[PDB]
């Protein structure tokens, strides 16, 4: 399938049916069963893994079973021509290891060996994995716990989970290759994550780095380099659906009625310009701006904003809010991963979660750790339930996807859904639960509008953050948990003394009693940056698998160890201490 | 303050109050609060951290709050000009990360972010730490667990503990820079730690290595190159305060009355010469020995002794005992860290504890592990209380600070206090509990006097040892515990069959039931050398912090995990296995 | 002396007079001669090395001769308090190597041993250098070729050259530490050198990295955040001294009279804003812009310009031209090193040359290699003299210091002089030889004015370029040579078919017949970037010494090998192939 926004086609998954090369009876008796395995996996993935636009992932099966190097080469050739970016080998029998291996170092790969007795399928799995480990080509091993009878095409639940987790992680990795990260502006207020380290994007993600000074926005606004007809529709949509909340600026800092109207007009134009920069716009070509019409083929981007832009122009809160949302004046759509303060590392943190879920991601500041003692002192209220041991205030500096309201619903529960599953009611409620507040001029002299909402509680979420550390390189931290509800009056008190015009999410991380998860305080004390990305659901296991494919160690996570799924080679670096083995594997491999 | 013994001034602690650069609002409303925060830290440190001579540590505060690079540069300039060797950044608000950072890679640094709600102080803390981690400049992060109201001048207990631990560790590290280790003699009886590895002193401690052959003592004794007036006073003092115990040498090995008198005279001259070599002596100038008067500016030194010196001259027991003590014929004073058998690694182990506590350190041999079974077999006594699981006999080859008697008392408990807190009674009791015994001529042919005492039990102590391992470099081991009392009859039996003319300390390490602390046997079986250093108190956490500043991994320690305080970067190398992360961080950073 | 533009004081040079520690006659007889050596060096440097503002460098001599570690520590202490950033040890006798060494790893250091016979001065030089080499502390060795009689205070010419070369290089290195590189804008048109690699600035130069989006210029222009009184004086000065040349834009691309006037006004404001950003401006504080008044303490900066800024606003040609010049509407002054296209690596290339000469540096594109064959075909003229083997066209995209005209004169020859040596005539002639041309709108849509001049021929110059290569890090290339004159009609033809509105310098590199200097073509074919920096004079030897102090290998240079002066340690890595030894030394040390 053609990628609807970026150059090229969406990555496909190649299935390699390996077989015993011996004829005279052996191979002849196994071709049908082997191909059936390949077809079963293709069916499973097509029903469980989808591209960001909702289309089911597409699979490519080798033209013949693979019993030797000639057929292995043929599969490699077909996969290269078909645009395969992930490979899965399947077999119910013994096959000749190195002769049948996928030797492409640039493709995530897994091997599923049927747990049958008639033929040495597990023997092949273990044999070929030894080969992948010996040759330095990381590969995932999938072995079902229960013996299945010959010919059984039903895929066991444990096998299904691994195939799907591998496929999603593999697809996410394949998705980033060749795409750009667009840096709009430069470093924002000395934030480390806004410094662009090209080596990371190039060598770990296979991405390109593009740059554009914020003065580009001045030019496009002044010369009207954007779809004027869309602009008018957008402004109208905003006036009808975006409710303006109270102005907290005290008289001396309040902007005039005229300024506030201009703040909206420019805020909308900023949204159009940012999107046009990321994916281009044919309309610009028709207007006589052919170069600008091309776009920067960016699957993720960031906007510096403070201090230079915001000291004079409306801030990027609205732009950053709307782009990351799953809808706007043009209807429901996939989000455009966009980082506040040009924090490219948070942008990538968001991108990882997005590519694994197809859901909008929430950019946030790890603002305050509220202990039970502190909440009791300040409000007189004793935290209860999930919040009993403390909570963490997640709140970005004025911008957050409207999906963050938690108003979208599934089975009577709060969630964030892929845009293609949204109902008109879901969207309507997200908007109703949001208030747009005139920006605090003491911080944002140029005005603008911040996003004010409160995430509904009880929603499972995962916060994560990618950091780059000297002497180590990229490193990922993860914290699965839940959003919580506080009594209205309690929230109001904690909220008012912090930043009531910004978006709030009350978070409680799952505790393990060990490491950085002994208590809630420790989770925040061990967070390596001032920002994090929030995704709906518990995607820690998926992030761990994705990280291992990228050779990015995970310094902190609260995912049950039984759910850790990494390439087989990792176990060769240690089975007692998985964390240490992870660092050793990422460094050597 | 001027260092009373070494070149230059004592290290100062610089306080950097960082602030939001935005004026016409934010900055003006935070100027007083931020500067007051800095002043509060200075006050706290001045009341809890003291130089080795008892003077309160001196702090330097930036002339203005730091909101950008210009002010950061001005703070760096002022700090360099005023002799700052440790820095602490403080703030209650958001500040511009890299623009406000302390970029001096040569000084220990910490950042304390106020846990307040009104401004993003914790956001700055995490943001700047991400910067320190990204740039490879280790920095400690201090974040209080309970939200405090704006302007709260009171520093919470958890924050206080971190500020003080960091300050003490940083000051100790700063104290060593530029000072010398003086090797008197060469390798002693093939002891690995008596081999001097200049790279360690130079690159890890910033120290210089000086050398002087023991023949220097022959020249100074023969030519009278020492303060003769002091010598006469010292001899008189020894005769009046140093009690001579029974001679255990049997006929043939017993020295004459004349020899024993000369042994005392030479032993005292040795003490004077050793001290003169370490810090110089202005008196030598008028005597016509100007070069010798200078000294070697050594904050630590060692004396080979066996086998060359002791095969003919009185041993170094008295010299090694007196220098390390907190008092002598000239009154109470700071110890002169001096290593027996020129074991420079034990000398540094002692120096670490000394610089962190200002208390005399005990040099000791890890002589015998006494299991409950062994004690029962040999004495018929069943070890009780803290000693119930076994004890370790710590006893140097004849020398130990008189402070080791444990006669010094505070609140009715045995301790070792900084010399400036000593009472006349403390000193008298230390001397009364000590007996000087004629050295065993089978070992020490030249005679001398060994120190015989028994450390009082119930005193919290910490033993430690620095080792240098090929392929790793320096590595530190720590064991907190207590001294114990044994029934007199039991002690006598164990003592008589070991070395009753030497100083005894019965030690029991705290057990954790894990690692090398599963049992008392394991603690000794895992000790990496024949020597260790004993400090009063449980200073393991302090030592761990100091080790991390020095990038020296800790291979073994029984400090509760919750008390481990290392630079923020360490967590980036692992949160589940702190030991592994420590090795990874020390090597890469 | 106080640095007139940056925080702190200008670096001082410390002189360490080492001596034999032996009294009884030796030391007593040498103190006078040893101190006399120290004084002689101080005098020599004060008369030959000057700070960028023309003030003579300041030296600090140790309070006593250094015969041991105590005195060495005293010198280190005095130097630290006096602001010493470069050290030179001097002695006419034998001294105790490691006991007298300068152990500061962060200070460039040299040792001058008197070539006398009475005392082993050369023995000390060789002995201590062996120590510096063994300890990994690079130090330069200075030994005169001719034996001098005892007490001779005259410094031989060969010794003088090394002392001065070391001092200038050392001072240049000391000058950069603690200063900022200010990035104005982001990457310019995918130019590699405009990507900022913080690790380079931090670890090699000890510099800070500051960032500001070009939108800052929009704000300051719109809100009048600059000295309006100076602005008026500047505009008047421009109208009176900057002659406007012909407009080459063809009708359809010509800007109106009104636009051209605005182009001048904005171009001038850009100059003021850029300078204010680099060093601050007290006037801004008086105007109510206290934060902006501070500046970014930048000793070098860059402006992205194309494509974002220039697509709408007047280009940075005038700003980049005037800042780099040695004069403007406020009179003669030190240049402000400013990089076109935010090429920070060319900015540093320029900074190296500037700090070694105090003269304005020329930013240029290595545009065209003109072979004799090509010139003959295109013009019918046969290149003569120095140009006989071909020439290289150096011409930046519209900006160049007016000093580049070569109109400044000394002894009837064309030169570029430090601003403090300029005569009114020199300045007047630089302006008269320059024409400001309306910018080519096909490239610069926002207009502006390019600098059009022709560098006078016969001037000795050195072009250089710093590049950062993956797997190597920073690497420097140098090409000494001369500017040449072409017959007027010949220049006109080559010029008109290239870019006649930009500044031209015709360059001929000195050839060696080997390496990258076998012919003129090879010099350009081996240039590692599209830009270079031009400095008056043959400063290749100075750049080589500076590079070795910074541990930056020199991949290409045409400096006679007899003039190569690097730390003594370099010879330990090879004496046959100096280039290979350079790479080996820079990597290991
Ligand atoms: Mn933020
Ligand atoms: Mn709200
Ligand atoms: Mn011993
Ligand atoms: Mn005893
Ligand atoms: Mn150019
Ligand atoms: Mn011209």
PDB file of C-alpha atoms in Angstrom, chain B residues 494-576:
ATOM      1  CA  UNK B 494      42.305 -15.570  71.534  1.00  0.00           C
ATOM      2  CA  UNK B 495      44.740 -12.677  72.006  1.00  0.00           C
ATOM      3  CA  UNK B 496      47.605 -14.692  73.529  1.00  0.00           C
ATOM      4  CA  UNK B 497      47.715 -17.159  70.620  1.00  0.00           C
ATOM      5  CA  UNK B 498      47.772 -14.396  68.003  1.00  0.00           C
ATOM      6  CA  UNK B 499      49.882 -11.296  68.810  1.00  0.00           C
ATOM      7  CA  UNK B 500      49.183  -9.848  72.300  1.00  0.00           C
ATOM      8  CA  UNK B 501      51.748  -7.054  71.907  1.00  0.00           C
ATOM      9  CA  UNK B 502      49.754  -5.567  69.015  1.00  0.00           C
ATOM     10  CA  UNK B 503      46.477  -3.527  69.052  1.00  0.00           C
ATOM     11  CA  UNK B 504      43.171  -5.431  68.945  1.00  0.00           C
ATOM     12  CA  UNK B 505      39.760  -4.480  67.583  1.00  0.00           C
ATOM     13  CA  UNK B 506      37.024  -7.132  67.513  1.00  0.00           C
ATOM     14  CA  UNK B 507      34.809  -6.391  64.509  1.00  0.00           C
ATOM     15  CA  UNK B 508      31.399  -7.632  63.397  1.00  0.00           C
ATOM     16  CA  UNK B 509      30.147  -6.516  59.970  1.00  0.00           C
ATOM     17  CA  UNK B 510      26.471  -5.799  59.350  1.00  0.00           C
ATOM     18  CA  UNK B 511      24.973  -8.662  57.344  1.00  0.00           C
ATOM     19  CA  UNK B 512      22.476  -8.454  54.484  1.00  0.00           C
ATOM     20  CA  UNK B 513      22.011 -12.141  53.734  1.00  0.00           C
ATOM     21  CA  UNK B 514      23.110 -11.389  50.173  1.00  0.00           C
ATOM     22  CA  UNK B 515      26.218 -10.666  48.121  1.00  0.00           C
ATOM     23  CA  UNK B 516      29.402 -10.855  50.189  1.00  0.00           C
ATOM     24  CA  UNK B 517      27.406 -10.181  53.345  1.00  0.00           C
ATOM     25  CA  UNK B 518      25.552 -13.484  53.710  1.00  0.00           C
ATOM     26  CA  UNK B 519      27.668 -14.273  56.768  1.00  0.00           C
ATOM     27  CA  UNK B 520      30.728 -12.961  58.613  1.00  0.00           C
ATOM     28  CA  UNK B 521      32.964 -15.525  56.893  1.00  0.00           C
ATOM     29  CA  UNK B 522      31.983 -14.162  53.475  1.00  0.00           C
ATOM     30  CA  UNK B 523      32.947 -10.633  54.442  1.00  0.00           C
ATOM     31  CA  UNK B 524      36.499 -11.699  55.213  1.00  0.00           C
ATOM     32  CA  UNK B 525      36.708 -14.214  52.371  1.00  0.00           C
ATOM     33  CA  UNK B 526      35.843 -11.356  50.015  1.00  0.00           C
ATOM     34  CA  UNK B 527      38.267  -8.799  51.432  1.00  0.00           C
ATOM     35  CA  UNK B 528      40.745  -7.971  48.661  1.00  0.00           C
ATOM     36  CA  UNK B 529      43.881  -7.315  50.697  1.00  0.00           C
ATOM     37  CA  UNK B 530      45.535  -8.111  54.013  1.00  0.00           C
ATOM     38  CA  UNK B 531      44.902  -4.569  55.271  1.00  0.00           C
ATOM     39  CA  UNK B 532      41.947  -2.275  55.895  1.00  0.00           C
ATOM     40  CA  UNK B 533      41.219   1.121  57.398  1.00  0.00           C
ATOM     41  CA  UNK B 534      38.796   1.573  60.293  1.00  0.00           C
ATOM     42  CA  UNK B 535      36.803   4.748  60.863  1.00  0.00           C
ATOM     43  CA  UNK B 536      34.448   5.498  63.717  1.00  0.00           C
ATOM     44  CA  UNK B 537      30.844   5.742  62.570  1.00  0.00           C
ATOM     45  CA  UNK B 538      28.819   4.379  59.679  1.00  0.00           C
ATOM     46  CA  UNK B 539      30.279   6.369  56.811  1.00  0.00           C
ATOM     47  CA  UNK B 540      29.529   3.897  54.035  1.00  0.00           C
ATOM     48  CA  UNK B 541      27.015   6.179  52.333  1.00  0.00           C
ATOM     49  CA  UNK B 542      29.511   9.048  52.453  1.00  0.00           C
ATOM     50  CA  UNK B 543      32.232   6.808  51.006  1.00  0.00           C
ATOM     51  CA  UNK B 544      29.919   5.662  48.205  1.00  0.00           C
ATOM     52  CA  UNK B 545      29.164   9.253  47.251  1.00  0.00           C
ATOM     53  CA  UNK B 546      32.878  10.107  47.363  1.00  0.00           C
ATOM     54  CA  UNK B 547      33.745   7.059  45.264  1.00  0.00           C
ATOM     55  CA  UNK B 548      31.229   8.057  42.587  1.00  0.00           C
ATOM     56  CA  UNK B 549      32.706  11.564  42.348  1.00  0.00           C
ATOM     57  CA  UNK B 550      36.102   9.905  41.829  1.00  0.00           C
ATOM     58  CA  UNK B 551      34.697   7.410  39.298  1.00  0.00           C
ATOM     59  CA  UNK B 552      35.893   4.525  41.495  1.00  0.00           C
ATOM     60  CA  UNK B 553      33.474   1.567  41.426  1.00  0.00           C
ATOM     61  CA  UNK B 554      32.422  -0.061  44.703  1.00  0.00           C
ATOM     62  CA  UNK B 555      32.721  -3.832  44.317  1.00  0.00           C
ATOM     63  CA  UNK B 556      31.435  -4.603  47.791  1.00  0.00           C
ATOM     64  CA  UNK B 557      29.428  -2.742  50.420  1.00  0.00           C
ATOM     65  CA  UNK B 558      26.622  -3.284  52.922  1.00  0.00           C
ATOM     66  CA  UNK B 559      25.050   0.171  52.740  1.00  0.00           C
ATOM     67  CA  UNK B 560      21.234   0.095  52.438  1.00  0.00           C
ATOM     68  CA  UNK B 561      20.248   0.748  48.816  1.00  0.00           C
ATOM     69  CA  UNK B 562      18.018   3.676  49.820  1.00  0.00           C
ATOM     70  CA  UNK B 563      21.125   5.482  51.111  1.00  0.00           C
ATOM     71  CA  UNK B 564      23.129   5.187  47.883  1.00  0.00           C
ATOM     72  CA  UNK B 565      23.612   8.699  46.489  1.00  0.00           C
ATOM     73  CA  UNK B 566      25.451   9.001  43.168  1.00  0.00           C
ATOM     74  CA  UNK B 567      25.398  11.427  40.214  1.00  0.00           C
ATOM     75  CA  UNK B 568      22.179  11.356  38.197  1.00  0.00           C
ATOM     76  CA  UNK B 569      23.999   9.866  35.206  1.00  0.00           C
ATOM     77  CA  UNK B 570      24.482   6.590  37.080  1.00  0.00           C
ATOM     78  CA  UNK B 571      20.755   5.797  36.854  1.00  0.00           C
ATOM     79  CA  UNK B 572      21.049   6.076  33.070  1.00  0.00           C
ATOM     80  CA  UNK B 573      23.323   3.029  33.202  1.00  0.00           C
ATOM     81  CA  UNK B 574      20.819   0.929  35.140  1.00  0.00           C
ATOM     82  CA  UNK B 575      18.215   1.164  37.910  1.00  0.00           C
ATOM     83  CA  UNK B 576      17.676  -2.533  38.687  1.00  0.00           C
TER      84      UNK B 576
END
